[PDB]
Structure 1
């Protein structure tokens, strides 16, 4: 009863999934998942990485990975443009699916995938790995327990500078048709996954966006950048509470600055993913000792004890994916719900596309 695993793609997220599947039973116990099929192109790369990743075989044929009888679950980590075709084929073949974010390039493709997931009766989860840190999970539990009273404001950002260099060449990812959203698709969807986990569903957005580098080098000429480098939005949650939201792929000096804070009637929680082992908690205290606490990640926080019994031994980015794999393992076993599945993921896609629509039309966008 070991879970049979297929992996499609071996890049940033492909290798991250491979490391997660390899150690999920080391951390959490039970039977090690069997690493059956690795799909990647070209074939010589799939063969080489299948060998070093410990997959029983590599193939250049992604459909082989979704249709092998020894496969129960498929990790899909290919470019956004391929997610709908590969996820639907995996569900149609009766496989559980771990799909990297975002779901697809459009709300329409995500809607089709959401319907296909319901029809398949298989488990799905989307790769929102910033919801998996012990610090983030600890913050959600502290809010649930009334540690900061009633939330009254959310402020969140996700700054990186991977596109700040204007000489970085044009690519398909910078077109609407083949790339979908820009910073909202690469980073915004992550901040939404964290924001709605803390504050509940979004009822309304009003957004602005900018393209800072509007044209890029392309084969001796230049081509237009058609999606946003940065976006900001004001939020009304279904609770009526306010929010501030931003993302940027051109924010110089920032590498993984997913940073958020929840202000409540009885305290404040604050976090920055660049220091993912620290959670700042303010609660009213006597005047002589009053102030924010630095909570350093350790075994009191969800998931941490599976990796290390001693506090302050920093939890890493890649271990978030081991926690994500375990949540999908337990969901497949009927011992837990995985979040977000394709239904909860579709809502996230509607929010980021709603922000893009609001920025273009200059109108607030309402949900439900």
Structure 2
């Protein structure tokens, strides 16, 4: 438990979970939401305050999570940083890279920790693969497929789904995109319901990333290819398999050993929030800062522009 005054700005569906975590691991002053009823129920459930304004929240805390709609991230984070308050912003960072540039600048001027909520970085399989030190993968192939739900029309297939694997790509490789091509399929509306991007980075890595909001059953998978290894990750079922050239148990693939990696299930959002607060308190680097958030944001905008161009021809 960290000794820190914390708050959440925006306590809808996911903001409430942020608030639960902060209440468990820090001194949660309370919450603010534009819908007063909703803040009031969140505060009643967590036994914190429901604040009458964002400013009165900010007066009583050192750090906040910002879990408001993406188009509001800039204005809210601007107010929060003007008050010298550190910020964990839910992904995606902002709507465009100029807002992200401005908040990075204001954060540096204020000597504030700026973290973006890119939860997939703290997934147990990704942590294990980073600690294995395999180097930059040469090829990544990923699928993020979500069933159509009443709210799916507000799911941006690139900015809300694919951005996870775009970010993972940029992190595991440490490289920058040189070429982005993409296709999209729009069934319900003019907006893509599924998209697939083919990204070439400046170290020669290729990422082949699919996302959909209209599938039957969920699917969250990533296959990763190095020169001497193959990693298969089921994010949903929390499983990891690593193949190397070996001693013969794998059917249909000769001369390879499949190592089933024993992954522990942990609370990802609790992990991300503890990391944010430790970064403030120890001055150590946070799991995903503003710079990385903007990197993936620029890539995702490239993908989306390509997708909308495909769909419009």
Instruction: Give the TM-score, by structure 1 length.
Output: 0.76
SS in 2 for 1:2: coil
Q: 1:232 aligns with which of 196, 207, 216?
A: 196
Cα shift at 1:361: 4.2
1:162 equivalent to 2:128? Answer no
- Tell me how far apart the structure 1 counterparts of residues 163 and 259 of structure 2 sit (CA, whole Å): 29
Which region of structure 1 is more displaced relative to structure 2, 83-92 or 46-55? 46-55
Cα shift at 1:80: 1.2
Unaligned runs of 5+ in 1: 25-32, 175-181, 215-224, 299-314, 363-368
1:267 equivalent to 2:229? Answer yes
Q: 1:282 maps to what in 2? A: 243
Residues 1-368 of structure 1 mapped to structure 2, 5 A cutoff: 2-24=3-25, 33-55=26-48, 57-66=49-58, 68=59, 70-142=60-132, 144=133, 146=134, 151-163=137-149, 168=150, 173=154, 182-203=156-177, 204-214=179-189, 225=190, 227-254=191-218, 257-276=219-238, 278-287=239-248, 290-298=256-264, 315-316=265-266, 319-361=267-309
Q: Measured at CA, do residues 198 and 170 of structure 1 come closer, stay the same or move farther in structure 2, by a change above 3 Å?
A: closer
SS in 1 for 2:147: coil
Q: Measured at CA, do residues 206 and 288 of structure 1 come closer, stay the same or move farther in structure 2, by a change above 3 Å?
A: closer
- Tell me how far apart the structure 1 counterparts of residues 217 and 145 of structure 2 sit (CA, whole Å): 9
- Tell me how far apart the structure 2 counterparts of residues 240 and 169 of structure 1 sit (CA, whole Å): 38
Q: 2:253 maps to what in 1? A: none
- Tell me how far apart the structure 2 counterparts of residues 349 and 116 of structure 1 sit (CA, whole Å): 18
The C-alpha deviation readout for 1:230-272, integer Å capped at 9, x for no partner, is 2111111221122211111112211xx3311211111111112
After superposing on structure 2, the runs of 4+ consecutive aligned residues of structure 1 that deviate more than 6 Å are none
Contact 1:267–1:281 under 8 Å retained in 2: yes
SS in 2 for 1:292: strand
Cα shift at 1:326: 1.5
SS in 2 for 1:340: coil
Unaligned runs of 5+ in 2: 251-255
Cα shift at 1:183: 0.6
- Tell me how far apart the structure 2 counterparts of residues 185 and 4 of structure 1 sit (CA, whole Å): 31
Q: Measured at CA, do residues 93 and 169 of structure 1 come closer, stay the same or move farther in structure 2, by a change above 3 Å?
A: closer
Cα shift at 1:118: 2.4
Cα shift at 1:60: 4.4
Cα shift at 1:49: 1.4
Cα shift at 1:87: 0.6
Superposed CA RMSD in Å reads 2.2
SS in 1 for 2:80: helix
Which region of structure 1 is more displaced relative to structure 2, 106-115 or 330-339? 106-115
Contact 1:200–1:237 under 8 Å retained in 2: no
